[PDB]
Design an enzyme around this catalytic site. Structure first.
Site, PDB file in Angstrom:
ATOM      1  N   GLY A   8       0.918  -1.200   0.031  1.00 14.34           N
ATOM      2  CA  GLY A   8       0.000   0.004   0.141  1.00 14.34           C
ATOM      3  C   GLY A   8       0.700   1.215  -0.006  1.00 14.34           C
ATOM      4  N   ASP A   9       1.941   1.335   0.818  1.00 12.19           N
ATOM      5  CA  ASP A   9       2.768   2.559   0.898  1.00 12.19           C
ATOM      6  C   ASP A   9       3.392   2.710  -0.669  1.00 12.19           C
ATOM      7  OD1 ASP A   9       4.189   0.132   1.118  1.00 12.19           O
ATOM      8  OD2 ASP A   9       5.867   1.128   2.400  1.00 12.19           O
ATOM      9  N   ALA A  10       3.789   1.656  -1.264  1.00  8.76           N
ATOM     10  CA  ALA A  10       4.395   1.670  -2.426  1.00  8.76           C
ATOM     11  C   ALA A  10       3.607   2.362  -3.553  1.00  8.76           C
ATOM     12  CB  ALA A  10       4.831   0.437  -2.945  1.00  8.76           C
TER      13      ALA A  10
END
Ligand SMILES: Cc1cn([C@H]2C[C@H](O)[C@@H](COP(=O)(O)OP(=O)(O)O)O2)c(=O)[nH]c1=O
Ligand SMILES: [Mg+2]
Ligand SMILES: [Mg+2]
Length: 239
Positions: free
Chosen positions: A186-188
């Site tokens: 998700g951060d990517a």
């Protein structure tokens, strides 16, 4: 407050207190700390409880329960987005329930953004300690300015101006991407959105640390991956 720290919590009762305490003991004290707990077990809630007495803490607990609700969206992205909407800080930064901030992390990152108006997103180096005492030590460096952050830079290693969020939401409709196809990274995916507009500036110091040694997994959609994101940025050609 100058900084809004957004931390997500779910069932890491043996690590969460160290995480929270590392934030509350920062040498730069002008922040609010969102603790977004995703309806964790009793043990976890009880370890978090005493920290709610710090006036900088803003605690929110979801009512999420069961496999359907847990896989309907990328949970921590939904929680982050919720926090972002309540945030007052000029600078935004992220934390998780098993990541530890070094004591001068906020001071240094704030100083970098205060000092360089041209930089909108910064990232630090990050270290992981393997336990089994210590057996392995990994460091993810921050030596270059990058237009390709996905999967090269972690969740807890970045701080950015609130204005970045504005840009992102204008083009994509939300801040972080809640689609569950991006559950593992998700951060990517958030970084992928940001990298449409901003590069990531390095701060070459190790400012966060990690300590390390099913019905849920079977109910997500097919998970897209890093290469897909990185390749898409490489195209584009922002740098
Ligand atoms: C599974 C799950 C995680 N989270 C939070 C806990 C963590 O802060 C964050 C990331 O989860 P985590 O399991 O720590 O991811 P990683 O595999 O990279 O260690 O998501 C929720 O808020 N809700 C959930 O249902
Ligand atoms: Mg983790
Ligand atoms: Mg990860």
């Amino acid at each position: 407050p100058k900084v809004s720290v957004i931390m997500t919590s779910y069932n890491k009762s043996d690590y969460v207190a160290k995480s929270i305490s590392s934030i509350l003991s920062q040498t730069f004290s002008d922040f609010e700390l969102f603790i977004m707990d995703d309806n964790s077990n009793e043990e976890t809630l009880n370890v978090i409880r005493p920290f709610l007495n710090d006036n900088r803490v803003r605690f929110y607990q979801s009512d999420i329960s069961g496999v359907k609700e847990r896989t309907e969206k990328t949970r921590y992205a939904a929680l982050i987005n919720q926090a972002i909407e309540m945030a007052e800080g000029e600078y935004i930064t992220y934390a998780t329930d098993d990541n530890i901030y070094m004591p001068d992390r906020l001071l240094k990152m704030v100083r970098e953004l205060d000092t360089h108006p041209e930089k909108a997103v910064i990232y630090s180096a990050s270290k992981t300690y393997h336990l089994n005492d210590i057996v392995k030590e990994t460091v993810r460096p921050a030596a270059q300015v990058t237009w390709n952050a996905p999967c090269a830079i972690d969740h807890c290693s970045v701080m950015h101006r609130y204005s970045v969020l504005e840009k992102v939401k204008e083009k994509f409709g939300s801040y972080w991407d809640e689609s569950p196809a991006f559950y593992r990274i998700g951060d990517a995916r958030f970084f992928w959105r940001v990298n449409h507009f901003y590069p990531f500036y390095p701060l070459d110091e190790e400012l966060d640390l990690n300590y390390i040694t099913n019905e849920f997994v079977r109910n997500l959609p097919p998970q897209r991956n890093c290469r897909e994101l990185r390749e898409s940025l490489k195209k584009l050609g922002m740098g």
